[PDB]
Ligand binder design. Structure first.
Ligand SMILES: Nc1ncnc2c1ncn2[C@@H]1O[C@H](COP(=O)(O)OP(=O)(O)O)[C@@H](O)[C@H]1O
Ligand SMILES: Nc1ncnc2c1ncn2[C@@H]1O[C@H](COP(=O)(O)OP(=O)(O)O)[C@@H](O)[C@H]1O
Lengths: 374, 43, 54, 54, 374
């Protein structure tokens, strides 16, 4: 408070998290949604607004069309993005952006112009003194405590695995897959139609996402678990809807996350995450693979399915040579780990040299971010 | 000691020497435990 | 009540509180920061990205 | 207009057709065989290479 | 001889060519792909085969998973090669294999078991009377009218440079390098993802390959050309996708082939093609250096990029000694030349002693090809 502390903002497709530099915990975590009313409103003299933003939007789900501003990790509606950032700065943190620097995170492989846009609407409108952009998955490795290893980050919008050697990333070995939690929610909604239950609107998609977060797990063996569900009815759970109805999902608990390992269910050509990180390792040099097998770190919201670590280790050990040792690293707070890495990066004294000055931006236009940020 | 070292280095050239070693050589990288590093936590 | 702290406790769900307590107990950022060797090793590493970028 | 000679022609990719036209005009194989000296020279080459073989 | 002409079959890594000996043009050139259906077929009476081979497979790209039987110049699916040979003999040419001799081409350096397997397949199942195996790079020089010179070959499998000295292939100076057209296509995807265009399935790889074939050129000077492309938009051109969308390639046109000269873009630690040719000439004796610098022939599919000739001449001049005779001889038909050389070699009367009889194979097993053909 005596000195200006930077703002660490982690912004993915699913939720937005914001906090102060050097803090243990982010101050605000809220879904990245902008809702607009659809029904006729006749109640004059009481509270109506033309648009709802943040957790207030998810509170009044029954009278809105929920609309995600970030699609597959790419910003597609910039006005809603500015509204999200305004609600982040003023409603939640309640600090003006002009006093403090801000730090943003972004996907590894992306359209170029997005970064330019993230520059232009951050200096021109919010009048920040300085900012910086960092790759999301590097911060997971920084927060885990390791300078060398391969990290998979599978958020709600995009999945990507990057190998980092001696704290300094390799661009040619970066693998990006467009398969994340939202596609899993859509697949779960599609396969829940076969039992009779129907979910079609946006609030129903939020309810289905809640069902997925509550009752899903990854089977160690798909065939054995499927035969087990074919034998008895011990794999049945009952979830109570906000209407008051009770549904019994049963067999679908381990079929929804299995699309992560077998993307042929969705019809996509690309194969599962385990062989994806195997190919990412194989694209690197032979000498560094020994450190890469022993330092595999999982991160992101989708990687919080129960039993994901054992299945991942078994598959990647089946793919790996027999003489090599496999170690998976699953932090218990992996869902926030990227933000934690940001808090590490905003506290280093050398990082004061990294900041893009406002004068430098005014001199060089919005293209300063490619040469300044790596 | 000197002849043993010479046979060791010559073997490292790829030369096949039938000399057996009274004191054999052990090569271990070892590892320093660091408290900042998160454990592997696998079962 | 009208206090924003009471509404802050009123609004947010149980799992967010659970995560906040879980990653407040371990204090990962403090463990990375106040430990000298790792902190000043990243100090140096960021120094060579400055050296190396331009 | 039902014979297969029509059939492959419209199943040709255009660039392959045009390469056929160009190398048809070019006639490399005919020139190499018609030239006496280089023909009997390469005959000698392959003959005594075979002779060296067995 | 007079009654029957030997079949000239060139098995390139990307394309397959076939024709009759003594003819100027090959009768059938088709892609070397095999596709399997990926979706359930519900139309009962329209007729669906188990797998599609060649041009029929490439017509229906949207419903198939295309697989290449030849990978990096090494066969990885032998029954798939049986399928491609069956399609070549029976469908494209409509001639029986038992009534004509066949001619096969091969990479200069291949494993012994590969040659043995090709001979065993060609005699055991197809029951061909006579066959012969030739080095791919040697026949290009025969098509060139030359007997002494250095041959650079680059296909979809691998790029290699050999010296030839009155029909002798020096085994020590043959150099190999893994910069093929497929890697350039993959790098074209990797640089196209910057603009905002995403291609991920094996069907779109043919679209990206067509973009590479139609809109690319090699910069004479890279550093000046990047500044030229940044200054103005006159280098940008538009391509029209099969679904009707229009893309603007722009800067990347001279960035796709530049991986040939600087392999550090792809992450490979090897040297460029010019250094490979220079080192290949450096490994030979002094006496033949003068007629290797004064005689260079380019061949292969990759070597038809516009402007590759002048760039190659300049880069090999920069490494050659002073006042040295340097000339590059690139025929316009440089990636049909292997079939032309094969037909030329099969046309001669003294070539008829090269044929391996069925009795010879039956007596000496599949290992006779190495003793008969050195
Ligand atoms: N405990 C959990 N169990 C299963 N899935 C979860 C869990 N928590 C989050 N998810 C999934 O992960 C998504 C959130 O991912 P997140 O890491 O917040 O994305 P980002 O942070 O990149 O925006 C949610 O949409 C949800 O589908
Ligand atoms: N007209 C062209 N322009 C640019 N590139 C081409 C052209 N024709 C072929 N190619 C490239 O050459 C490759 C085919 O090489 P090919 O000659 O089939 O190799 P091989 O020597 O193994 O037969 C294709 O991948 C394509 O990218």
């Amino acid at each position: 408070d005596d000195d200006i502390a930077a703002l660490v903002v982690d912004n993915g497709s699913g939720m937005c998290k914001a906090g102060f530099a050097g803090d243990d915990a982010p101050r605000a975590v809220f879904p990245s949604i902008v809702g607009r009313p659809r029904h006729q409103g006749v109640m004059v003299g009481m509270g109506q607004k033309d648009s709802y933003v943040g957790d207030e939007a998810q509170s009044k789900r029954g009278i809105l069309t929920l609309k995600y501003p970030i699609e597959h990790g790419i910003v597609t509606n910039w006005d809603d993005m500015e509204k999200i950032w305004h609600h982040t700065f003023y409603n939640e943190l309640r600090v003006a952006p002009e006093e403090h620097p801000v730090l943003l995170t972004e996907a590894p492989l992306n359209p170029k112009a997005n970064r330019e846009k993230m520059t232009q609407i951050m200096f021109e409108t919010f009048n920040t003194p300085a900012m910086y952009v960092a790759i999301q998955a590097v911060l997971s490795l920084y927060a885990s405590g390791r300078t060398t290893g391969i990290v998979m980050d599978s958020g709600d919008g995009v999945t990507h695995t990057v190998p980092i050697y001696e704290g300094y990333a390799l661009p040619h070995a970066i693998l990006r897959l467009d398969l994340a939690g939202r596609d899993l929610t859509d697949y779960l909604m599609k396969i829940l139609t076969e039992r009779g239950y129907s979910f079609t609107t946006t609030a129903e998609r939020e309810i289905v996402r809640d069902i997925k977060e509550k009752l899903c797990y990854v089977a160690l063996d798909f065939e054995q678990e499927m035969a087990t569900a074919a034998s008895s009815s011990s794999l049945e759970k009952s979830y109570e809807l906000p209407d008051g109805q009770v549904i019994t999902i049963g067999n679908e608990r381990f079929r929804c996350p299995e699309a992560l390992f077998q993307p042929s269910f969705l019809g996509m050509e690309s194969c599962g995450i385990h062989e994806t990180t195997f190919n990412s390792i194989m694209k690197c040099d032979v000498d560094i693979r020994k450190d890469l097998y022993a330092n595999t770190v999982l991160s992101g919201g989708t990687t919080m399915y129960p039993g994901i670590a054992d299945r991942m280790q078994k598959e990647i050990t089946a793919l790996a040579p027999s003489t090599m040792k496999i170690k998976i690293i699953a932090p218990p707070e992996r869902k926030y780990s990227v933000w934690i890495g940001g808090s590490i990066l905003a506290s280093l004294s050398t990082f004061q040299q990294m900041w893009i000055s406002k004068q430098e931006y005014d001199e060089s236009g919005p293209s300063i971010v490619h040469r300044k940020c790596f | 000691h000197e002849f043993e070292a010479l046979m060791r280095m010559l073997d490292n050239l790829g030369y096949r020497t039938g000399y057996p070693y009274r004191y054999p050589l052990v090569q271990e990288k070892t590892k320093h435990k660091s408290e900042v590093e998160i454990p592997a936590t696998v079962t | 009540e009208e206090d924003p702290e009471y509404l802050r406790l009123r609004n947010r769900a149980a799992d967010l509180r659970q995560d906040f307590n879980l990653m407040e107990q371990k204090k990962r950022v403090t463990m990375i920061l106040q430990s000298p060797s790792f902190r000043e090793e990243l100090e140096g590493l960021i120094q060579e990205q400055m050296k190396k970028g331009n | 207009e039902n014979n297969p000679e029509y059939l492959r022609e419209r199943n040709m990719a255009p660039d392959l057709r045009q390469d056929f036209n160009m190398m048809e005009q070019k006639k490399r194989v005919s020139m190499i065989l018609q030239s006496p000296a280089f023909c009997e020279e390469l005959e000698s080459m392959i003959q005594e290479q075979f002779k060296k073989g067995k």
